[PDB]
Design a protein around this ligand. Structure first.
Ligand SMILES: [K+]
Length: 211
């Protein structure tokens, strides 16, 4: 083939690839959990490696376009226009790829935060089961032994409160810096506070019943 035909073949292939990547990068799937965000991050790494491997494909197509544009044999305006368009599309793909990377990393941080919150909610739930006891002591000796167990539990809740505040502080930062949607973090933070207040209230009600 001549240089015109080789460029046209290369451009048909490059154009198809650009269309594929444009469609892939328009996905707003940020995942539902840490395992699915991790799969999206692996997928996105491979795509970014594919884009990187095409930046040299683009250099070659650019060199072909520049050689074609020196020709006196045909009107080179279609070559010039194609070169402009493949370059503009490629640069937009690099911008979309960086934006999707930032959102996937944000999503990973958010889902890791949710896992950290789940560990705290499991702690809360274990303690809530302890203070849900409706044994208030058969006698003076029996309530004295329950009152000493309950003061130890209240001291555990007070010593854990900095960890609960740390979850709220982290959640505020993530919410304020969020670009992918705050509906889930808002709901989870509210539900988390409800879980902590419920445990504190149930512990305080039980403590009053042991006096
Ligand atoms: K914990």
């Amino acid at each position: 083939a001549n240089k015109q035909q080789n460029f046209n073949t290369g451009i048909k292939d490059f154009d198809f690839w650009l269309s594929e990547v444009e469609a892939l990068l328009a996905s707003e799937d940020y995942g539902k959990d840490l395992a699915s965000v991790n799969n999206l991050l692996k997928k996105h790494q491979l795509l970014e490696a594919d884009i990187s491997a095409h930046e040299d494909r683009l250099k070659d197509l650019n060199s072909q376009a520049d050689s074609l544009m020196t020709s006196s044999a045909f009107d080179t305006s279609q070559v010039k226009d194609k070169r402009e368009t493949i370059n503009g599309r490629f640069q937009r793909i690099k911008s979309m790829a960086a934006a999707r990377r930032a959102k996937l990393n944000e999503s990973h941080r958010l889902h890791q935060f949710f896992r950290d919150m789940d560990d705290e909610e499991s702690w809360i739930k274990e303690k809530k089961l302890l203070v849900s006891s409706e044994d208030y002591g058969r006698d003076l000796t029996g309530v004295q032994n329950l009152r000493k167990k309950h003061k130890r539990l209240e001291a555990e809740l007070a010593a854990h409160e900095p960890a609960i505040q740390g979850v709220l502080d982290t959640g505020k930062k993530l919410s304020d810096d969020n670009t992918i949607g705050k509906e889930e973090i808002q709901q989870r933070l509210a539900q988390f506070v409800d879980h902590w207040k419920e445990l504190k209230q149930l512990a305080a009600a039980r403590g009053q019943r042991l006096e």
